[PDB]
């Protein structure tokens, strides 16, 4: 089972979230961390596509 | 410092765990100042 | 010591409370930390 359906970065966005193989990262945080680099910086795993 | 770290409309919580840890360690800076009763008589009076 | 839930001179119950709190925070339960003001100077031996 995954977490409690939260972004895990901002804690306040739970809407059509995306799984990073460990959590429920949201859309904008995912786009920002993908534009930053290739790592995830919150689970240290390759980011999804 | 608290405002610069906490203020913001939308992009103010990109990494909230780091912000919380930093602010907590900043608030816990009170352990640097020692606790050696600057005055004894005044402290006894206040305790009474 | 005959009781169970109190954790003041029992490290096992302290660790149990710690892991319960950790699991609740990881799951998202309602955590309420209640500090009480003037615990000492308010209680009276007549209550006991
Ligand atoms: Zn987010
Ligand atoms: Zn991740």
Q: Exposed, middle or buried, C30 (CB in 10 Å: 0-12/13-18/19+)?
A: exposed
Cβ A29 vs Cβ B14: under 8 Å: yes
Q: Which residues surround ligand 2, an ion (CB under 5 A)?
A: A 20, 40, 42-43
Alpha-helix residue ranges (DSSP H) falling in chain C: 11-27
A-side interface with B, Cβ within 8 Å?
Answer: 9-12, 29, 32, 41
For residue A29 the two structure tokens come to: 């945080």
* Separation between Cα atoms, residue A37 and residue A23, nearest integer Å: 19
Nearest C-alpha in A relative to B10: A10
Q: Is A4 on the interface with C (CB under 8 A)?
A: yes
DSSP-derived letter for residue B27 is H
* Separation between Cα atoms, residue A40 and residue A31, nearest integer Å: 11
**Helix-strand-coil percent breakdown of chain A, rounded to 5?**
20, 0, 80
* Helix or strand (DSSP H, E) at B43: helix B40-47
Q: What is the dihedral of CA A30, A44, B3, B28, to 10 degrees?
A: 160
Nearest to A14 by CA among A5, A3, A23, A4: A5
């Amino acid at each position: 089972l995954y977490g409690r359906y939260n972004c895990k970065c901002c804690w306040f966005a739970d809407t059509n979230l995306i799984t990073c193989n460990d959590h429920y990262l949201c859309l904008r945080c995912h786009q920002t961390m993908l534009r930053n680099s290739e790592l995830c910086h919150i689970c240290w795993k390759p980011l999804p596509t | 410092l608290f405002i610069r770290l906490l203020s913001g409309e939308s992009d103010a919580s990109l990494f909230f765990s780091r912000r919380f840890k930093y602010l907590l360690n900043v608030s816990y800076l009170c352990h640097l100042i020692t606790k050696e009763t600057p005055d004894r008589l005044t402290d006894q009076i206040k305790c009474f | 010591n005959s009781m169970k839930y109190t954790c003041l001179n029992s490290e096992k119950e302290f660790e149990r409370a710690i892991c319960d709190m950790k699991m609740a925070v990881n799951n998202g339960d309602l955590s309420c930390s209640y500090d009480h003001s003037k615990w000492g100077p308010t209680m009276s031996p007549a209550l006991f």
